[PDB]
Design a binder for this molecule. Structure first.
Ligand SMILES: Cc1cc2nc3c(=O)[nH]c(=O)nc-3n(C[C@H](O)[C@H](O)[C@H](O)COP(=O)(O)OP(=O)(O)OC[C@H]3O[C@@H](n4cnc5c(N)ncnc54)[C@H](O)[C@@H]3O)c2cc1C
Ligand SMILES: Cc1cc2nc3c(=O)[nH]c(=O)nc-3n(C[C@H](O)[C@H](O)[C@H](O)COP(=O)(O)OP(=O)(O)OC[C@H]3O[C@@H](n4cnc5c(N)ncnc54)[C@H](O)[C@@H]3O)c2cc1C
Ligand code: NA
Ligand code: NA
Lengths: 285, 291
């Protein structure tokens, strides 16, 4: 089912999970195990990421199909970096010919475009709509704290708006650790005339180091209390997992009481954190 | 001049500096040096903090008097913690008697180590009650400000409660507010759009702290609830043992922040100086704002 329709039909929240194409047999087995655990929560959709320059193209397709084989509804990510327009179009056709009806149109990271490539995710959005109309549902990235490369936050929101207007049905946010970042962004988007659902992206912390590297790359901020607490227990993995889960639970309880349309979980191909968050919220069907 | 009137009269930004009353001659000499340096930037006001439970209230009055006599325009902070209503009204009166016409009404914090705030048995519980007192007694003859928390106050049950409590505080009779420190302008802009959508129309001035010490940043944000951008955090952490590199990183970060707030047309910027001149000077110099 197209996410655009799920969002209107379902009055309770959509839970989604994000996974990446593992790069070796061991990784693949780990993801299969993670899938077997998380599918019992009956996610509204499951995303499969795409290597920035087209490096995972085959594996992304194969995992999209595998998600379908489990009875789950894939959201297929697709990037424009490092690919001709024709390459991007070919991969897109292969997703669509597989029965994938949900795409997440992204730029990807290296930034100079491919000589016959696109420059912006909005050009892929426009491609998809030009070729497939409403036969698919298209999402894009949003950055509550602003994309690192944007000259200003005003330009960031304007650029996001242009992307929406290319034909987005929904957006998924970059990770954030204080719900104020999300609600702020949401209000600013609405003031800018944007009406599409915008789903909060949540990463439950399972490792101090990982938190540090992720926020460093993507530009997200960490609350001072959370940082201190993680820093103290950084050497006790069980404590860290506990602290991350508690924090995501606090985050997600408020998002749901506020009426968000769904929550997208960055799982990093592991089940425990996401499982614990959902079980603590009373959300195991 | 009332900050209420400066904000309406002036179409460009107000610049303001926050200072704390030093405890001793050495601290006083240091602040007078900082003041001498920073007064060149011609701030529209200068704020003087108040020690949470009133034990240093006469230092706060003395510094308000010093600032007023230096031709600078004091914004006197005042808390309700650990003090009776009478005690609070007495200090309030002294400020006004000394010519102060701008007050920042605050709750104050319980002692370090205590997690429950409990009012004085005959004191106020919320800043809003101080606001109401001020207006009851002085009407519009003074200008009254409050605090705002773009990332939500650590004690608020939710961000929705946070905003509703802020709105009630505004409605008790605020002319402006100043934010808690923040390190990404998205936090400030988001809060503004939330406040507006809640029907708050007072000017809300961003509060900026230029980072001069890794460990201080960590403690302040641990206490405040504020967040640190991952890139900034990464850089400061790498260089935390070189104070000059930290100062340069903190200055550069604040320059980027302030440059965007001014271009967006904020009504001013309030600097948390911690009684030091170098970082704030450098920020403003680099923006070309030395007259
Ligand atoms: C939910 C989610 C999933 C992701 N999945 C993947 C993935 O599978 N693979 C991957 O490689 N990356 C992925 N990313 C990351 C993404 O590719 C990077 O964040 C990338 O740097 C930006 O992609 P975008 O589509 O958000 O960019 P765009 O919307 O193209 O924006 C890129 C930059 O250009 C600016 N810009 C936009 N339009 C204009 C314009 N008209 N003029 C000038 N500047 C403009 C933007 O403000 C930004 O600075 C994901 C991100 C999110 C939030
Ligand atoms: C610019 C600035 C300057 C400051 N200067 C000083 C200073 O000089 N001295 C000092 O000691 N502290 C100072 N503070 C810190 C301040 O005292 C603390 O943040 C304190 O914890 C809260 O004070 P407040 O006036 O913001 O609180 P209030 O507005 O009283 O709010 C306190 C808490 O109770 C909640 N609340 C408010 N109204 C209600 C209600 N009716 N019912 C239920 N809950 C409610 C709030 O949401 C919050 O959770 C300053 C803060 C800022 C931003
Ligand atoms: Na819905
Ligand atoms: Na003004």
């Amino acid at each position: 089912m197209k996410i655009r329709d799920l969002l209107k039909a379902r009055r309770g929240p959509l839970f989604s999970f994000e996974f990446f194409p593992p790069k070796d047999p061991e990784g693949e087995e780990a993801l299969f195990r993670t899938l077997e655990e998380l599918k019992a929560f009956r996610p509204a959709f499951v995303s499969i990421t795409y290597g920035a320059m087209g490096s995972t193209r085959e594996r992304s397709v194969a995992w999209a199909q595998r998600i379908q084989s489990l009875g789950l509804n894939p959201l297929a990510h697709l990037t424009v970096a490092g690919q001709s327009r024709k390459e991007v179009a070919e991969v897109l056709h292969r997703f669509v010919e597989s029965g994938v009806e949900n795409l997440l149109a992204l730029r990807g990271d290296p930034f100079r475009p491919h000589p016959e490539g696109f420059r912006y995710a909005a050009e892929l959005v426009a491609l998809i709509r030009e070729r497939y109309g409403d036969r698919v549902s298209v999402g894009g990235a949003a950055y509550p704290e602003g994309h690192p490369e944007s000259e200003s936050l005003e330009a960031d929101l304007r650029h996001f708006k242009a992307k929406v207007e290319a034909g987005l049905d929904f957006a998924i946010t970059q990770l954030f650790f204080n719900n104020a970042h999300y609600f702020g962004f949401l209000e600013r988007a609405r003031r800018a005339g944007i009406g599409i659902p915008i789903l909060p992206g949540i990463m439950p912390v399972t490792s101090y180091r990982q938190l540090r590297r992720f926020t460093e790359v993507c530009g997200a901020s960490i609350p001072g209390p959370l940082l201190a607490k993680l820093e103290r227990h950084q050497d006790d993995p069980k404590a860290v997992l506990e602290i991350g889960v508690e924090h995501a639970v606090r985050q997600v309880a408020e998002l749901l009481e506020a009426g968000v349309e769904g929550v997208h979980f960055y799982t990093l191909n592991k089940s425990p954190a996401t499982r614990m968050v959902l079980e603590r919220l009373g959300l195991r069907p």
